[PDB]
Symmetry: D2
Subunit: 129 residues, 4 copies
């Protein structure tokens, strides 16, 4: 299943070079994973209270083309792997013409926020995903 | 109580206009207040031990001239008022050529790291800055 | 003429205190002003074509209550004063319960995109508002 | 090896009580910028050379978190140089030298204005 999430580029996301700052795309990717979860009725604010959180363990991003001020982007997200305490997201960012701006592979681990120690993915989440 | 804090402008702080993003200055001011408090041994750790955190209640910023990529700036901070649960910080930012770029007045209140509700200023703070 | 803009709070907007970092609200306010102008067809592209840009000259924000991860906020924006070379925006942010989180008064000046010197507001903008 | 200190402020943390993962990415960039300054290549000097750098590929591995007020050290080294690109090997450690995360960054040299790939000026090549 492919989840899509729109993102408008504002001045806060750009840098003096005249394009989106590379670390801003990282944040866009996080927003997209969060919205995918929300689509399945899961709230990370609520989950933290149950001592369930998600942290990035490894992330690789390859950049191909820039995004500029006011561009409306689309973040595409897919879960390609699910294991005991982790899952692998495959994501990409494209613009209004579907030009591939960049892509990423993100290894996310489920953890108990208080001890920051890995824990098995909740069954309720696995069931939906 | 004048405290100076140097700050280098990096790409993360700039925007497509070729200058520092107006909200980035707000972050710079926060660092300077944090560092001035640290200068008086009021590190986050020390504050937490006193069951205290600071929240901005009101802030007015005047934008005069822009900071650019790689400029080394100096944030200047002073505490000009201390009453009840409130602290008033007066800050300004200048560049290497000493040009005035920005100025701010910040009213901050004291709260307990839990309820996030205002509380009286710890005895140590008033004693240190009065 | 009250323009409303929804904004979702993500991890990037929060801080260790468990609430939204105060500077994040400043960015939210900027997005809302940008979107109000867009609503009237004054996109960044349209403004550059008019040879004008808007810069914040003086801004005040008063904070009352906090926002947290996953909260859907509403930024309310209006031009409370239009002058020959400047605009005063009155803005406020409320949560889903309509509780006032914070409010702002923003003086923005019209300038030439090149020299960044003051410039009169284009007649198209004057006519529109 | 170039070392760059970085203090963690509220702006760098998130509601989880640790540094937001994208913040480390920004820290790595500052470190690269400072390493270049140390080798006589400040942004001014780079503009004079008509050079700007763009991240082409980046892999970061996260091992342990940093928290509010921690003083970190970013370690940076250029491990490869080829035509129009450079590979940076970096890592972030805390005051006890515990390894928090590490990254490999492939950067490409481009013209500031057009941002199109261009051979690394001999001024920089002859530097590293």
């Amino acid at each position: 299943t492919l989840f899509r999430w729109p993102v408008r580029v504002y001045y806060e996301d750009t840098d003096a070079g005249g394009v989106v700052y590379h670390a801003s795309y990282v944040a866009f990717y996080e927003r997209a994973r969060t919205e995918m979860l929300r689509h399945h009725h899961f709230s990370q604010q609520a989950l933290m209270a149950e001592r369930v959180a998600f942290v990035v363990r490894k992330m690789t991003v390859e950049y191909y083309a820039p995004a500029r001020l006011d561009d409306m982007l689309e973040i595409q997200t897919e879960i390609t792997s699910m294991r005991g305490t982790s899952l692998v997201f495959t994501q990409r960012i494209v613009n209004a013409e579907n030009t591939l701006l960049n892509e990423a592979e993100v290894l996310v681990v489920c953890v108990d926020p208080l001890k920051m120690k890995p824990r098995a993915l909740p069954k309720s989440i696995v069931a939906e995903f």
